[PDB]
UniProtKB/Swiss-Prot annotation, chain A:
The lineage of its organism: Eukaryota, Fungi, Dikarya, Ascomycota, Saccharomycotina. Present with 521 molecules/cell in log phase SD medium. This is THO complex subunit 2. Disulfide bonds: none annotated. Component of the THO complex, which is composed of HPR1, MFT1, THO2 and THP2. Together with SUB2, TEX1 and YRA1, THO forms the transcription/export (TREX) complex. THO associates with DNA and RNA in vitro. It is found in: Nucleus. Belongs to the THOC2 family.
Swiss-Prot record, chain B:
It comes from Saccharomyces cerevisiae (strain ATCC 204508 / S288c) (Baker's yeast). The chain holds residues 503 to 552 of 752 of the full protein. This is THO complex subunit HPR1. Component of the THO complex, which is composed of HPR1, MFT1, THO2 and THP2. Together with SUB2, TEX1 and YRA1, THO forms the transcription/export (TREX) complex. THO associates with DNA and RNA in vitro. Component the THO subcomplex of the TREX complex, which operates in coupling transcription elongation to mRNA export. The THO complex is recruited to transcribed genes and moves along the gene with the elongating polymerase during transcription. THO is important for stabilizing nascent RNA in the RNA polymerase II elongation complex by preventing formation of DNA:RNA hybrids behind the elongating polymerase. HPR1 is not required for sporulation, and is not essential for DNA repair. It is probably not a DNA topoisomerase. Present with 1340 molecules/cell in log phase SD medium. It is found in: Nucleus.
Length: 80, 50
């Protein structure tokens, strides 16, 4: 919970200020994979929670892959 | 044959200054306005910059 109260939320790190999408997801990727492995009813919570992407154009990109590419790490793609 | 007067002891304390710290150098660092509203008006819009 201490991570939640100190670091600002993902919605207004892209709206009030203007951070970049490589830098915005780098802070908020461990938290969005711990909550997705905690409960499956929380799976509908975070993916609805999304802000306006003023850096890149969402007009003919598929958000089924643009969100999917920025969410995964190397932990669940490679195995040895 | 000298009339000794009663002595006068000072019962007053010294007063402080308007500099709220020691130096004028250390005090200048503690006058910078800090907050989240100051970064807000500097980075304002990237698409306006782009």
């Amino acid at each position: 919970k201490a991570f939640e109260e100190n670091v600002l939320p993902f919605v207004e790190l892209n709206n009030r200020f203007h951070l970049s999408t490589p830098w915005t997801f780098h802070i908020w990727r461990d938290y969005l994979d711990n909550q997705l492995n905690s409960n499956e009813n929380f799976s509908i919570d975070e993916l609805i929670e999304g802000a306006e992407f003023s850096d890149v154009d969402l007009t003919k990109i598929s958000k089924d892959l643009f969100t999917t590419f920025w969410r995964l790490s190397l932990y669940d793609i490679h195995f040895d | 044959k000298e009339k000794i007067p009663p002595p006068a002891f000072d019962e007053t304390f010294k007063k402080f200054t308007f500099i709220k710290m020691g130096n004028k150098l250390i005090n200048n660092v503690w006058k910078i306005p800090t907050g989240l509203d100051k970064i807000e008006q500097e980075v304002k819009k990237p698409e306006g910059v782009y």
